[PDB]
Amino acid sequence: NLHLLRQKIEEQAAKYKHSVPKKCCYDGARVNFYETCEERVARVTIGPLCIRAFNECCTIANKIRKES
Ligand SMILES: [Ca+2]
Ligand SMILES: [Ca+2]
């Protein structure tokens, strides 16, 4: 469900008040191949906030894809 996915990611991204961790979130939400969120976030080295945003948005996206 791409419509819901978009809205829920926007809702979470809005919590990050700078474009860099915003993009960390958006990038996180794109993870949908064979690597899990945990595996994929291990290579994110920008800093703790970027890692949290990537994690949260990857997790949100994954849940939504699962429920569709
Ligand atoms: Ca921008
Ligand atoms: Ca990226």
Numbering used by the authors: 679 to 746
Question: Anything the authors wrote about it?
Answer:
By targeting its receptors C5aR1 and C5aR2 on a wide range of immune cells69 as well as endothelial cells10, C5a promotes inflammation, vascular permeability and coagulation. Mirror-image aptamers, also referred to as Spiegelmers (from German Spiegel=mirror), possess the high target specificity of conventional aptamers and are in addition plasma nuclease resistant, therefore having high therapeutic and diagnostic potential. Here we report the crystal structures of NOX-D20 in complex with either murine C5a (mC5a) or its C-terminally desarginylated version mC5a-desArg, at 1.8 and 2.0 Å resolution, respectively. The structures reveal a complex 3D architecture for the Spiegelmer, including a left-turning double-helix and an intramolecular G-quadruplex stabilized by a Ca2+ ion.
Crystals for the NOX-D20:mC5a and NOX-D20:mC5a-desArg complexes both displayed a P21212 symmetry and diffracted to a maximal resolution of 1.8 and 2.0 Å, respectively. The resulting model was then used to solve the NOX-D20:mC5a-desArg structure by molecular replacement (MR). Unexpectedly, the asymmetric units of both NOX-D20:mC5a and NOX-D20:mC5a-desArg crystals contained three molecules of mC5a and only two molecules of NOX-D20. The final models encompass residues Asn679 to Pro750 for mC5a, Asn679 to Lys744 for mC5a-desArg and all 40 nucleotides for the Spiegelmer. The two structures are equivalent, with an r.m.s.d. on all atoms of 0.25 Å between the two complexes, in agreement with the fact that NOX-D20 binds both anaphylatoxins equally well. mC5a adopts the canonical four-helix bundle conformation which superimposes well with the structure of isolated mC5a (PDB 4P3A23) with an r.m.s.d. on C-alpha atoms of 0.43 Å. The NOX-D20:mC5a and NOX-D20:mC5a-desArg structures reveal for the first time the active conformation adopted by an L-nucleic acid aptamer, in particular of a mixed L-RNA/L-DNA aptamer, in complex with its physiological target.
